Amino acid sequence: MSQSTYSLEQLADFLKVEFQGNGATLLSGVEEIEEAKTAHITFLDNEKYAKHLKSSEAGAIIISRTQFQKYRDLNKNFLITSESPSLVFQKCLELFITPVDSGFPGIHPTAVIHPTAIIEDHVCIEPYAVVCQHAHVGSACHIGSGSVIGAYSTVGEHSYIHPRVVIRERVSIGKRVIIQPGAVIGSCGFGYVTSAFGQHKHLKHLGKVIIEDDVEIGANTTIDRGRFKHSVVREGSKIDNLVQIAHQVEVGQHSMIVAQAGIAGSTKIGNHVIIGGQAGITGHICIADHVIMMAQTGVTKSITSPGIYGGAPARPYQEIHRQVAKVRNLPRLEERIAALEKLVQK
Amino acid sequence: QSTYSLEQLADFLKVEFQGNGATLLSGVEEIEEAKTAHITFLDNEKYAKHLKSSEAGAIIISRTQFQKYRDLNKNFLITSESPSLVFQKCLELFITPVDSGFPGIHPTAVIHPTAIIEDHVCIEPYAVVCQHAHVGSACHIGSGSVIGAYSTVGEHSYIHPRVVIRERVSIGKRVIIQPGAVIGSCGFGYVTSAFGQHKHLKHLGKVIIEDDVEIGANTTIDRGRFKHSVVREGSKIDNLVQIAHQVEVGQHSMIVAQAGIAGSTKIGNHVIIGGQAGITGHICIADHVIMMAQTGVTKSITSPGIYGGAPARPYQEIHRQVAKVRNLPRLEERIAALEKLVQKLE
Amino acid sequence: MSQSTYSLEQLADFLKVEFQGNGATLLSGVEEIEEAKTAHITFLDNEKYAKHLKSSEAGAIIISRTQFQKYRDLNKNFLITSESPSLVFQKCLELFITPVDSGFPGIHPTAVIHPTAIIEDHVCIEPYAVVCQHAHVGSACHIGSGSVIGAYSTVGEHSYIHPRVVIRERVSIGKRVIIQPGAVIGSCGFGYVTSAFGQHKHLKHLGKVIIEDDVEIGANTTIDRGRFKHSVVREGSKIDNLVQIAHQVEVGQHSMIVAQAGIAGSTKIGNHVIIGGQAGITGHICIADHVIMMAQTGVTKSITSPGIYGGAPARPYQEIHRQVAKVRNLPRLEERIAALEKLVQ
Ligand SMILES: CC(=O)N[C@H]1[C@@H](OP(=O)(O)OP(=O)(O)OC[C@H]2O[C@@H](n3ccc(=O)[nH]c3=O)[C@H](O)[C@@H]2O)O[C@H](CO)[C@@H](O)[C@@H]1O
Ligand SMILES: CCCCCCCCCCCCCCCC(=O)O
Ligand SMILES: CCCCCCCCCCCCCCCC(=O)O
Ligand SMILES: CCCCCCCCCCCCCCCC(=O)O
């Protein structure tokens, strides 16, 4: 059974949103548009859902103003918003599954905080978390169970650090950053001096890592500091689980890096970039703004222009689509040769 | 340390032997490396090289492979069961397992007043059990592990140190979780805005880990927005694997290390995923499908059998295409052999 | 707070190095060769750069004696060394940026140490680290916050273990070994016996993990133990972030494994081997000494002689470079066929 029941109108009012349809319609859960039934709230998200909308049995559909002007004649209950539909849907989702926390509010007796560390107002620090010398945790932060905030590291207001995250020394974490469990920020970069015919001597890496506002970093993802320059991750970028970011990597604004991709040292990535799952980018190159790399891409040279790329080495997608096809067509090209090899006349 | 004779072993294992029964054995070893004091085993068409000239004092072997080598004057232990399983029986005679030496519930374990901890459970130093969690009987919760809000761990499960189990996770019976794993990380899903900017969505689905599942070190399993992610019973998952939001892994399936499945993909029962393979989201993998290491699965696999390559094709077809790509200089030379016969002048 | 400025001459005296140029030149930081300004010390270690040298604006360039001869005519401030310019550069770096510890000296009161664990002199153990029955921490070792040192595991003198590393039971860690946060040393190997109905039997692992001296291991890298014999990483090898080292893998000496690479069971890597980022190596094979594997390599067969290998399946550099070129050429190739086929024989 469900947690709550709402009428269309009651919910529209709660959401400070407009509605069209039957205000007395009863709503008791959420569902994706292709599976929603009378009782369900759903949303339309701007894709080929034309016929997904007409055939929708949902009791309430969250739709933007522009999209509603186009489907005004349809006999459906709409919740009409100026915000993005998915975001308003999120608000409806949390009426049915309320978000929950660990049950340890404020600073826990077992939190270890260095006397020189500065903790601001209204912060939560969970069991066994460690805050090292001269660190600075901004107001309304959450430091999860057993996380380490390293020496001289700053954490901007409203950031949410999950359990067992390690933030090493000299790391700048911006406002409203979300780090999932098991991330390591400011691990030493993979750089050495070579000696005695190939033996490798450790170099101390003294660069920072700068994590700007509204950045998210996924579970077990590792971000290496530069040797003397900073690794940076700019505003609004999101980074999925299990990603390697190497020393002195720059990742521009509102970029996205999907699980298990890796970027080698000293590479810059532009703004509005998508790096697909398991892709890899060599060191010492650049990726332009608005580039999209397909999963499992291997980037060997700089990309200087926007568009989709894939393969290894990466090529513009038109080129590798062609490549895969010509390769698959090899036997048919060989029978084409053998037939033309048969013609050996006088 | 103890010692066993060939007859003294055959009788314990309840197995038939052949050779010198008074032979003295004192350990296990790999077929190539085993001397007189060593028990070994054969379980390959591709390890037969090392049998003809082995020095083991006992060779565990199947009724099938025995038919090839019974003429050889080696000491055998012949089984109608898995040679490797019987091998394990011998190995567990010579090496004992060892624990931390922190029995029961440690004084430093933080258990929220509203959590339920059953009987005969071990919770190691600095582990944190959050509100309304249920830890079943005969469980082991490793040092510094987190058991999130409203999460349950079925009886006889084993959570290694520094594992993070987040909110509303269901861990089934006799599950083993290796160190560093993160169960119930947030799925990589965002709301894109007017200016290409990405808005965080709290993911509120469950992760359901069924009975007998094992999960490797530093592996990450994401939860769906509101629908569930599932790893069905029997499935074994290796190190450094990404399991994305709302993925469903069928029963008795294997996912090898560094492999990755993208959001909303369903994997059938008895599927093997070779290492470093990635599979795209929103597709289906049929039961009994085997993906080779480094496979790149772009489209749903409808039929069972072995697949490999990127894009994924059946074994026979990629093996073929690898051969035909290798043969391109030959193919071009026979075009040069043909562009030379333009000697057709008049 | 090292807002510090030194003179080129002071620098040279500190470093014990010859200089060419204005000794009064004021240096107040470090920079990479193509960005260095008059306030900046930089270095040239690779001839791969050197094109940035002629135009360089650095207030000092750390250079070798050979390179000086090559570039003598030039009007630059040089610090001339018989050592590695990158190792001399490091001494300058450390002059402007000072390493910082956590500020938790010695053994922190909240460290759990089993009555049967052995702790030597001058050891740091940080808040909430856990040391199990019969473990051994060497002299002058650092055990970072919340790290676990498992049952009967030894950590050799002068090792540095960062926060939340899990060192499991029966792991030997050598001298001077560094382990970045989150690595897991001694997880169970991935070993099973699939039954007729399709179900998979867990095989208990009781072998060990041996990490030799001067080895380094990256963040969240995971090194599994063997069914009955040890996984081993030999002297001076450096393993990057997020790597899979399976059960019974042996890594030789002075080898390097770049991030996300992976190696399957019972595989042998020789000495002075480089495995590139994201590369993958099957089980039960060997890689010869002095082999270089390109990034994203898929090695399916043993490499038995030295050199450079790339692609998936891996081939020597020559065969793989040629293959890419020939695949790249298929439209041009069938174009030659398209021209041929319009014969009227
Ligand atoms: C993959 C990648 O991107 N770089 C690799 C390469 O870097 P490489 O040796 O080229 O230089 P690194 O990036 O390691 O050194 C740090 C910085 O020094 C600067 N610099 C380098 C040489 C020089 O003569 N003058 C100078 O100013 C470079 O711009 C670099 O950003 O070999 C190192 C040897 O272990 C690895 O750590 C690095 O991962
Ligand atoms: C140049 C080799 C050809 C194949 C294409 C390879 C693309 C590069 C993949 C490297 C993975 C990046 C991992 C980061 C490692 C690090 O630098 O610390
Ligand atoms: C169309 C894709 C081209 C290549 C095919 C390779 C399959 C993709 C591999 C990606 C694996 C990573 C999945 C995690 C995704 C996530 O968490 O959002
Ligand atoms: C066509 C041949 C397949 C492609 C080549 C892939 C080479 C192997 C890549 C996977 C590495 C396996 C490491 C996983 C460790 C483990 O088994 O636990």
Q: Which domain holds residue B112?
A: 105-315
Structure tokens at A304: 């200087």
Helix axis angle, C317-327 to B328-336, nearest 10°: 60
Element (H, E) at A327: helix A317-328
Q: Distance, CA B158 to ligand 4 centroid (Å)?
A: 28
Distance (angstroms) between ligand 4 centre and the Cα of B266 equals 22
C91 in contact with chain A, both atoms CB, cutoff 8 A: no
Q: Spell out the residues 6+ positions from residue A58 whose beta carbon is closer than 8 angstroms to its own.
A: A31, A33, A36, A37, A38, A40, A41, A42, A76, A77
The reply to whether C61 and C129 lie within a common domain is: no
Residues A129/A131/A137/A139 CA torsion (nearest 10 deg): 50
Q: Which long-range contacts (CB under 8 A, 24 or more apart) does A98-101 make?
A: A98/A3, A99/B202, A99/B204, A100/B131, A100/B149, A100/B150, A100/B167, A100/B168, A101/B131, A101/B149, A101/B167
Reported as type and span, the H/E element at residue B317 is helix B315-326
Nearest CA among B236, B177, B219 for reference residue A242: B219
The answer to whether residues C198 and C328 belong to one domain is yes
Q: How many CB atoms lie within 10 A of CB C17?
A: 18
Residues 6+ apart with CB under 8 A from B148: A102, B130, B133, B164, B165, B166, B167, B168, B169, B184
Asked if C164 and B162 come within 8 Å (Cβ–Cβ), the reply is yes
How far is residue B337's CA from residue B335's CA, in Å, rounded to a whole number?
5
How are beta strands C26-27 and C6-7 bridged, if at all? antiparallel
Q: Is the peptide bond before A85 cis (omega within 30 degrees of 0)?
A: no
Resolution of the structure in the document, Å: 2.2
If asked whether residues B310 and B333 sit together in one domain, one would say no
Contact of B321 with B313, CB cutoff 8 Å: yes
Distance A3 CA to ligand 3 centre (A): 35
Q: What is the CATH number of the domain that holds A318?
A: 2.160.10.10
> How far is the C-alpha of C148 from the C-alpha of B179, rounded, in Å?
10
Per the listing, tokens 């506002």 go with A213
Which residue, A55, A73, A106, sits at the end of a domain?
A106
Cis peptide bond upstream of A181, omega within 30: no
C248 Cβ neighbours under 8 A, 6+ residues apart: C189, C207, C226, C227, C229, C230, C231, C265, C266
Looking at the annotation, which residues of A are catalytic? Answer: 247
Q: Which of A200, A227, A263 to mutate to test the pocket of ligand 2 (most atoms within 8 A of CB)?
A: A263
Interface check for C264 against chain B (CB to CB < 8 A): the answer is yes
- Residue B151, token pair as written in the block: 């999460």
Calpha distance C42→A250 (Å, rounded): 21
Statement to judge: residues B208 and B256 lie in one domain: yes
C263 within 8 A of C246, measured Cβ to Cβ:
yes
Q: Are C278 and C264 in contact (CB under 8 A)?
A: no
Compute the nearest-CA separation of C162 from chain A (Å): 9
Q: DSSP string covering B189-240, please? A: -EEE-TTS-EEE------EEE-TT-EE-TT-EEEEPSSSPEEE-TT-EE-TT
> Could you tell me the distance, in angstroms and rounded to a whole number, from the CA of residue C23 to the centre of ligand 1?
28
| Ligand with an atom nearest the CA of residue A229 | 1
Q: How many helices (H) and strands (E) does chain A have?
A: 6, 39
Contact A144, A164 (CB under 8 A): yes
Q: Which amino acid is at B27?
A: G
| 8 Å CB contact of A190 and C220 | no
C202 is catalytic: no
**Beta-bridge partners for B78:** B16, B61
- The Cα B256–Cα C261 span in angstroms is 14
Question: Which residue in A84, A260, A331 is closest to B193 by CB distance?
Answer: A84
Q: Are residues C193 and C235 in the same domain?
A: yes
B260 in contact with ligand 3, CB cutoff 6 A: yes
- DSSP assignment letter at B105: B
CA distance C330 to B232: 45
Q: At B161, which helix (H) or strand (E)?
A: none
Q: Are A289 and A307 in contact (CB under 8 A)?
A: no
Tokens 């991935």: give the residue: C190
What single DSSP character describes residue C189?
A: P
Closest-approach residue (CA) in chain A for B186? A180
**CATH number of domain containing C78:** 3.40.1390.10
Residue among B54, B23, B21 at smallest CA distance from B40: B54
**Are residues B2 and B79 located together in one domain of the fold?**
yes
Q: Is A296 in a helix, a strand, or coil?
A: coil
Position B266, amino acid = K
3-state secondary structure of A214: coil
Q: Report the DSSP pairing between strands B236-237 and B254-255.
A: parallel
Pair (C231, C94) in one structural domain: no
Q: How was this structure determined?
A: X-ray
Q: Considering only CA atoms, which of C95, C63, C59, C60 is closest in space to residue C82?
A: C63
Spot the catalytic one: C40, C158, C247, C290: C247
Q: How far is residue A148's CA from residue A128's CA, in Å, rounded to a whole number? A: 9
Q: Are residues C172 and C220 in the same domain?
A: yes
Q: How many Å lie between the alpha carbon of A106 and the closest alpha carbon of chain C?
A: 20
DSSP designation for B292: P
What DSSP element (H or E) covers A106? Answer: none
Residue type at position C239: I
Look-up of token digits 């094709």: B313
Atom 9 (ligand 3): residue with closest C-alpha? Answer: B278
Integer angstrom CA distances of residue A240 from A235, A276, B237, B297 = 15, 10, 19, 20
Residues with CB under 6 A from ligand 1: A 190-192, 227, 248, 264-266, 283-284; C 32-33, 42-46, 49
For A228, B57, C38, C82, the CA distances from C79, given in Å and listed in that order, are 19, 66, 14, 10
Q: Where do we find the tokens 């084409």?
A: A336
Count of beta carbons in the 10 Å neighbourhood of residue A307: 12
Both tokens assigned to C265: 């069971």
Measured between alpha carbons, how far is A297 from A308 in angstroms, rounded to an integer?
Answer: 11
Whether residues C122 and C242 share a domain: the answer is: yes
Q: What is residue C291's three-state secondary structure?
A: strand
Q: Are the CB atoms for C277 and A280 separated by under 8 Å?
A: yes
User: Does one domain contain both C188 and C314?
Assistant: yes
> Which of residues C53, C75, C106 is at a domain's end?
C106
Give the containing element (helix H, strand E) for C6.
strand C6-7
Q: In Å, what is the CA distance from B312 to each residue of B285, B295, C6, C194?
A: 12, 6, 60, 25
Q: How many domains does chain B have?
A: 3
How many whole angstroms separate alpha carbon C237 and alpha carbon B238?
24
Tokens of A172: 């700048």
B263 and B209 housed in the same domain: yes
Instruction: Choose one of A106, A138, A168: the last residue of a domain.
Output: A106
Residues A152, B35: Cα–Cα separation, whole Å: 58
B139 and B98, same domain (yes or no) = no
Q: What is the CATH number of the domain that holds B336?
A: 1.20.5.170
* Chain B residues touching C192 at Cβ < 8 A: 236, 254
Question: What are the Cα distances from residue A111, in Å, to A101, A124, A130, B141, C261?
Answer: 17, 10, 6, 21, 36
